[PDB]
Amino acid sequence: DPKIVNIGAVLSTKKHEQIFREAVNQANKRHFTRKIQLQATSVTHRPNAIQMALSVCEDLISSQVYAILVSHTPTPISYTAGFYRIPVIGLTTRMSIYSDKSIHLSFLRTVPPYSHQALVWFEMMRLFNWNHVILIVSDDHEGRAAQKKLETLLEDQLSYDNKRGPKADKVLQFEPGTKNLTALLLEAKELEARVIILSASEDDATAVYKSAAMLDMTGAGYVWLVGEREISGSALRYAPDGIIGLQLINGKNESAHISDAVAVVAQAIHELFEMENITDPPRGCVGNTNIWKTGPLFKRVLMSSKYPDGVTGRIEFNEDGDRKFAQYSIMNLQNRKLVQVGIFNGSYIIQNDRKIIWPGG
Ligand SMILES: *[C@@H]1O[C@H](CO)[C@@H](O[C@@H]2O[C@H](CO)[C@@H](O[C@@H]3O[C@H](CO)[C@@H](O)[C@H](O)[C@@H]3O)[C@H](O)[C@H]2NC(C)=O)[C@H](O)[C@H]1NC(C)=O
Ligand SMILES: *[C@@H]1O[C@H](CO)[C@@H](O)[C@H](O)[C@H]1NC(C)=O
Ligand SMILES: *[C@@H]1O[C@H](CO)[C@@H](O)[C@H](O)[C@H]1NC(C)=O
Numbered sequence: 001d002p003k004i005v006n007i008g009a010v011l012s013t014k015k016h017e018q019i020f021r022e023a024v025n026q027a028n029k030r031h032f033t034r035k036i037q038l039q040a041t042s043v044t045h046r047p048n049a050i051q052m053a054l055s056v057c058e059d060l061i062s063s064q065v066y067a068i069l070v071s072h073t074p075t076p077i078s079y080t081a082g083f084y085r086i087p088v089i090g091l092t093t094r095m096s097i098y099s100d101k102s103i104h105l106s107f108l109r110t111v112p113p114y115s116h117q118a119l120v121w122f123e124m125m126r127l128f129n130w131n132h133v134i135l136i137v138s139d140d141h142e143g144r145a146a147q148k149k150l151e152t153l154l155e156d157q158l159s160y161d162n163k164r165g166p167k168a169d170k171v172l173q174f175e176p177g178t179k180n181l182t183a184l185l186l187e188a189k190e191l192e193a194r195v196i197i198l199s200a201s202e203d204d205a206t207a208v209y210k211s212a213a214m215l216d217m218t219g220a221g222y223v224w225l226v227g228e229r230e231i232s233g234s235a236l237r238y239a240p241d242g243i244i245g246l247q248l249i250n251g252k253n254e255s256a257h258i259s260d261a262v263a264v265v266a267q268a269i270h271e272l273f274e275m276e277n278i279t280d281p282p283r284g285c286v287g288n289t290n291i292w293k294t295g296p297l298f299k300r301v302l303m304s305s306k307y308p309d310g311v312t313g314r315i316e317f318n319e320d321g322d323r324k325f326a327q328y329s330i331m332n333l334q335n336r337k338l339v340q341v342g343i344f345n346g347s348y349i350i351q352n353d354r355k356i357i358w359p360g361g
């Protein structure tokens with residue numbers, strides 16, 4: 001007699017589906033009830049967008065899932081499920097587009113968008129009194145989201161220094177995929193400030209680094225401050241010694257995010273079922289143009305939910321459905337090896353015992 005409540009997932013490997021089932025099992029044990037029983041339904045990723053979308057319909061929506069967890073585009077899944085207002089919960093995708101206020105309105109996620117790295121840059125600027133910076137961003141959605149985020153952060157018996165706040169003397173943008181960025185770097189060289197912040201893809205970061213090298217701008221006096229993509233994979237080849245980048249703590253731990261996302265979903269499902277006039281999700285896509293009437297409400301329940309005991313830390317989502325209070329390892333390139341010199345713990349920079357080597361040091 002328990003009502004079966006299916007949770008869906010699209011995960012990377014069979015082993016992660018096992019982690020998913022175990023999480024759903026844990027959730028049933030956590031919440032005693034005879035009115036509903038949580039069930040796990042999952043698939044792994046298909047090789048292309050078309051097959052992925054079809055599988056979402058054939059394998060997941062056909063089982064009447066209430067939500068779909070998705071590891072790392074999640075684009076076909078977000079769109080296919082969003083059509084019906086079934087919440088899609090991204091476990092590892094960091095691209096800022098999913099945070100946009102106009103599209104992907106059924107999506108939320110347990111990791112922050114790359115644009116949120118700007119919070120950490122801000123604290124770094126405060127800690128080391130970098131009051132003048134140059135921001136170089138790719139002229140695409142991701143580059144501009146980083147810019148927008150950083151700018152937002154920038155914009156009687158007790159004495160105050162009242163020092164003018166940190167400031168971006170200039171924002172320079174480049175066309176993604178451009179192989180020769182000499183003109184841009186020279187434009188930056190003409191400027192006073194020697195603190196350079198970069199938002200760029202792995203591929204574009206290399207272009208920036210090579211141009212900075214050619215112009216002798218990676219040596220003493222300069223500071224390079226970047227995010228995670230700009231010190232990942234191929235971007236590390238020409239990354240200047242002394243550069244500072246970031247790694248999202250637990251950011252690639254799919255297993256941990258599956259556990260936390262299931263916990264959040266189960267909690268929200270129990271709250272949902274205390275409400276009157278709840279409706280069942282769609283059973284299948286074929287000739288079905290109806291939305292899940294309760295879909296939008298369930299997403300609101302999910303996004304306003306709080307799960308303090310996550311394995312990835314406290315879980316809360318902001319108004320765009322992005323994870324709040326993310327923690328980041330602060331990485332410093334030393335002898336061509338990334339060295340962790342501290343943590344941004346959600347609000348403050350906590351330095352450790354290792355010392356930072358600055359560019360040319
Ligand atoms: C990130 O680092 C910051 C700074 O160390 C941490 O904030 C600090 O947290 C402690 C413990 O919660 C706070 O102490 C407590 O403050 C309250 C009142 O505000 C009081 O009732 C407690 O008994 C105790 O004194 C401390 O004030 C706070 N400091 C700052 C600067 O806010 C924070 O906990 C770290 N975050 C994580 C997730 O680790
Ligand atoms: C990922 O997180 C899980 C917690 O479920 C932990 O058991 C595992 O050690 C983590 N893996 C890595 C490489 O951090
Ligand atoms: C749900 O719908 C019923 C039937 O119209 C209505 O009487 C009731 O007030 C509604 N319950 C809530 C809490 O909205």
Ligand SMILES: [K+]
Nearest residue numbers: 098100103104
């Ligand atoms: K969105």
